Design an enzyme around this catalytic site. Structure first.
Site, PDB file in Angstrom:
ATOM      1  N   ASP B 334      -5.784   9.355  -7.785  1.00 36.42           N
ATOM      2  CA  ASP B 334      -5.297   8.922  -6.466  1.00 36.42           C
ATOM      3  C   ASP B 334      -6.490   8.551  -5.570  1.00 36.42           C
ATOM      4  OD1 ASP B 334      -2.874   8.817  -4.352  1.00 36.42           O
ATOM      5  OD2 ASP B 334      -4.332  10.209  -3.495  1.00 36.42           O
ATOM      6  N   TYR B 465      -7.140   8.059   4.614  1.00 34.02           N
ATOM      7  CA  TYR B 465      -6.342   6.821   4.784  1.00 34.02           C
ATOM      8  C   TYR B 465      -6.662   6.088   6.078  1.00 34.02           C
ATOM      9  CZ  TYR B 465      -2.981   8.677   1.307  1.00 34.02           C
ATOM     10  OH  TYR B 465      -2.402   9.189   0.199  1.00 34.02           O
ATOM     11  N   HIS B 523       3.504  10.201 -10.489  1.00 35.76           N
ATOM     12  CA  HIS B 523       2.272  10.176  -9.701  1.00 35.76           C
ATOM     13  C   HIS B 523       1.314  11.352  -9.921  1.00 35.76           C
ATOM     14  CE1 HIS B 523      -0.300  10.672  -6.144  1.00 35.76           C
ATOM     15  NE2 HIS B 523      -0.592   9.408  -6.446  1.00 35.76           N
TER      16      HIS B 523
HETATM   17  I1  LIG Z   1       1.558  11.148  -0.899  1.00 35.68           I
HETATM   18  C1  LIG Z   1       2.156  10.053  -2.595  1.00 35.68           C
HETATM   19  C2  LIG Z   1       1.295   9.027  -3.016  1.00 35.68           C
HETATM   20  C3  LIG Z   1       1.657   8.242  -4.114  1.00 35.68           C
HETATM   21  C4  LIG Z   1       2.914   8.552  -4.746  1.00 35.68           C
HETATM   22  N1  LIG Z   1       3.517   7.962  -5.820  1.00 35.68           N
HETATM   23  N2  LIG Z   1       4.705   8.550  -6.085  1.00 35.68           N
HETATM   24  C5  LIG Z   1       4.875   9.550  -5.202  1.00 35.68           C
HETATM   25  C6  LIG Z   1       3.790   9.608  -4.318  1.00 35.68           C
HETATM   26  C7  LIG Z   1       3.424  10.374  -3.240  1.00 35.68           C
END
Ligand SMILES: Ic1ccc2[nH]ncc2c1
Ligand SMILES: Ic1ccc2[nH]ncc2c1
Lengths: 546, 546
Positions: B334, B465, B523
């Site tokens: 992420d 962010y 995710h």
């Molecule tokens: I905060 C967040 C970021 C990306 C995501 N993808 N799928 C669920 C989800 C929650």
């Protein structure tokens, strides 16, 4: 009036300079003079090399562009390069051959020690070559010793562009007349001079250092041999492992490679290894400098039995278990040296190699009580003074600054007899209330030990001496064993308690034992003779610890 | 009624059993039957092997004594061993060939999971052979999964002596009828039976596990594939590095070998890698699982600019500098995956290899403001909801347990649209106040995240962010670069925000890019598909990260 010194990397802090090696290549290859240096410099500010130095492209992207410049320079020259010609090979070899100019770094170190702000200003690239680690390592070693590292590829500007000099000034928080700027490139030196900075054109290091010494008024040439790099506690990685519900072990960690676990003695700290930690990490090892149980940030339970060798050794095994380490090289001094021999005897599978400073390995006498044994040697009288709970705690904790100042002294300057300590009624009975500062330590270093010992005092540390019978019973189980893993015994000539002669029969139990010996060295080995300790340990580690 | 299970090592937890391999050697060598097994067992309780197993002598001391027994057994046999015969070679080879009996360990794991106290009871030796690390590593991997490890050479007693069984009972705090004891040696099994312990003679594992399943009433055979080993936070080595006056970075560290730096995403923790940390350390790597800036035990300054990519990346470089690491493999997920691509672009010399889970690498569009770019994709609406300071903090901090429970869910069980988040006025607007527990997490694991986030909340994390313009301006400087260091892109089929298709043009900027793809994965990649993540990362690390 100067207060800042700036050094270039290529041809100043690292040797040798590119133009010389590109010249060397032209000659080795019988190529027309200056062709390589020419294709390298092609298009000047608009060229491939400038883009590389500004960070627009990486080293691997630049390689084929330099190749294309070489051919085009050869075409005009009415020359043809051979079919075995490689820019990658040439540059890999040159970067690899380049080493830190040790005397230049020493001068930068001395200037900073005298209060100068120091910096490296360099026209460099973003290295993505398979061999980039060689350069990464060099920049790591160099950068730690400076206040600032300004890299052209990071800031998007290069020397000789004026903005980089203005960027440097803004970084330094200095006006140009307060700055010495050293460069091997005349063209890269002019903008600094234009601003009114003191400049030194660097050809041979000696002349450059003579000019630097003259302008600063600080001795940089012919100075005494410097001490090894020490540790700033606040700049270290601090690790904490819970070995059992009530016990947590603290350690300082530096470097990559085989784990080397440093075990201090009484009444010390991880900080006793301050001169060894950077050197050993620089030598290619992962250093774990412990606060032994009862000390500094490690737990200090009050119970005497918590400090017997069996418990201490078991906890050190758990420490490795929790860190995911199948082995570590164990290096100890004083009480740590004793633990380290017992780790080798009881857990050889977890001990990659074992080394002891001052502490000999003497097998337990099953026919004599350990108390009888200690009594037989006059120098071990202080150990009897330590037996009674509370007595030595009260004297040692009365004035921490006096304690460490009286203890931490070279063989030349002692104030402590260590003689008939019980009869005299104390360690410091005939000692000054305000001892002078040993040549070995600074006041700041004494204060670090003082602050560490404010947490738990001397109970847990003194408890290391309060398990003579328990340690003896456990050690007797190892009487039929021999130490057959790689081992090093380091004796200190002037340690008047842990005398070198005490280690004389060690080969009977450690047949392949290797040795080191330090002349004119007292009990506090690591801070007494740091350079010699570093030399002995690194040499032994590289040959026997892998 | 059973509550404890005891396992032997040789022939039970590790395969194969000594007597079989000594038998195999006799045959390979055309030696009279049972001679090797006989010399091994020579003198019985008074013999060399018993002394070795009791800890009286080391393995290296025992070797020449076993050699002498072999000759004497051959002499009586009217046989002569060849001149190439080596006990050391035979035993080195056998110890090395011996591996963990994976299904036996799985049964021990399941029993302990069901509340059993488990232990390893073994007749072993003190290994001081040059090759001792192979055995040390095996014992390390095995021991972590058990409550107790009782080694004959440590306790000075061996099986079949009754005192070791009484020692085992005293260690377990159990009466014999509460104990299952598994052994491959009939003679070593009898004393346990004599005491009234449930015993299983172990020949083939399946039959032994069938008997174990019957006696315990717990399914051990044919069970579903287990999850990888997780982390108990209190059992980890916790590291702390100050990267600047107001910023300290916390990390969990496990293993030895090349440094692998794990970088979590939003709103996570070092604990998001709990399933990866033991596996990667077991695969031969030094894992450093970070609490990224703004999270857990790491500092969380309030300023938005503290969380732009340039500052975050610079701090990660300093983190390596302070630890004495010239490089590390960087693995991110992420927001961590984004940082990891920028580490590769800006500091390739410090990046051994780069891998990202879900986060693609998309070069900045210099012709479109990042805000315009985010608006173009409906799924990135939640990012706009995160822009306004305080809004998302208030919703996310209102009920921590609801926050993590609503967020951390498999693709099969979501409660969050991620659709028109701003218009709806929140992430949890149409979400239950008391969400059910995802199959992915336990209540205890949710509580760990809850406790971590009680320290600093969501400000610092949400600030990651809040630097779209700053990150865009910095990323634009890297527009002419390519990633040429080893790289891995891992896509998750059911990540409905970081969709696999978003990574489709990556090869244009990372020509040698390697890939991994996880089907039916949402995710929260690491906890959704831990086994698959581990398989992809270890395989890529061994081939490309060295
Ligand atoms: I905060 C967040 C970021 C990306 C995501 N993808 N799928 C669920 C989800 C929650
Ligand atoms: I406490 C202690 C232990 C050993 C020593 N040797 N020389 C001085 C000294 C002080």
């Amino acid at each position: 009036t100067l207060r800042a010194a700036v050094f270039d990397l290529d041809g100043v802090l690292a040797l040798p300079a590119v133009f010389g090696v590109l010249g060397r290549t032209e000659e080795a290859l019988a190529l027309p003079r200056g062709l390589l240096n020419d294709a390298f410099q092609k298009g000047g500010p608009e060229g491939a090399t400038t883009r590389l130095m500004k960070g627009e492209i990486t080293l691997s992207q630049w390689i084929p562009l330099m190749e294309e410049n070489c051919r085009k320079c050869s075409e005009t020259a009415k020359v043809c390069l051979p079919k075995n010609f490689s820019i990658k090979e040439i540059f890999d070899k040159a970067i690899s051959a380049r080493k830190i100019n040790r005397p230049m770094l020493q001068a930068a170190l001395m200037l900073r020690k005298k209060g100068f702000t120091t910096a490296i200003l360099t026209n460099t690239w973003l290295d993505d070559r398979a061999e980039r680690d060689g350069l990464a390592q060099l920049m790591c070693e160099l950068k730690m010793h400076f206040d600032f590292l300004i890299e052209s590829c990071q800031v998007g500007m290069v020397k000789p562009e004026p903005q980089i000099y203005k960027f440097l000034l803004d970084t330094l928080k200095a006006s140009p007349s307060e700055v010495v700027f050293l460069d091997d490139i005349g063209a890269n030196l002019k903008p600094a001079r234009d601003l009114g900075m003191v400049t030194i054109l660097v050809q041979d290091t000696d002349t450059a250092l003579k000019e630097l010494e003259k302008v600063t008024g600080i001795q940089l040439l012919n100075t005494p041999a410097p001490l090894p790099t020490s540790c700033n506690p606040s700049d270290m990685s601090h690790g904490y492992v819970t070995v059992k519900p009530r016990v947590r072990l603290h350690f300082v960690e530096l470097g990559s490679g085989p784990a080397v676990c440093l075990c201090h003695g009484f009444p010390e700290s991880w900080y006793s290894w301050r001169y060894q930690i950077p050197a050993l990490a620089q030598a290619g090892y992962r250093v774990l400098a412990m606060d032994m149980k009862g000390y500094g940030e490690s737990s200090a339970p009050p119970e005497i039995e918590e400090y017997c060798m069996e418990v201490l050794c078991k906890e050190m095994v758990t420490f490795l278990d929790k860190l995911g380490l199948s082995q570590a090289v164990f290096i100890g001094h004083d009480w740590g040296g004793m633990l380290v021999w017992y780790m080798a005897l009881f857990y050889p599978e977890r001990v990659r190699a074992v080394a002891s400073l001052n502490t000999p390995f003497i097998p337990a006498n099953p026919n004599m009580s350990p108390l009888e044994s200690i009594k037989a040697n006059p120098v071990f009288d202080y150990q009897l003074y330590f037996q009674e709970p509370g007595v030595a705690e009260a004297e040692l904790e009365q004035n921490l600054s006096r304690t460490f100042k009286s203890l931490f002294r070279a063989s030349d300057e002692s104030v402590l007899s260590m003689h008939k300590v019980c009869e005299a009624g104390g360690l410091f009975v005939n000692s000054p209330e305000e001892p002078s500062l040993s040549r070995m330590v600074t006041e700041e270093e004494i204060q670090f030990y003082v602050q560490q010992f404010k947490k738990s005092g001397f109970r847990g540390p003194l408890n290391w001496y309060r398990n003579m019978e328990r340690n003896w019973k456990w050690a007797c189980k190892s009487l039929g064993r021999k130490i057959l893993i790689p081992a090093l015994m380091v004796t200190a000539e002037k340690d008047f308690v842990l005398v070198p002669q005490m280690s004389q029969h060690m080969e009977d139990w450690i047949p392949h034992l290797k040795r080191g010996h330090i002349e004119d060295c007292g009990h506090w080995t690591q801070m007494d003779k740091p350079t010699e300790v570093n030399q002995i340990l690194i040499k032994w580690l590289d040959s026997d610890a892998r």
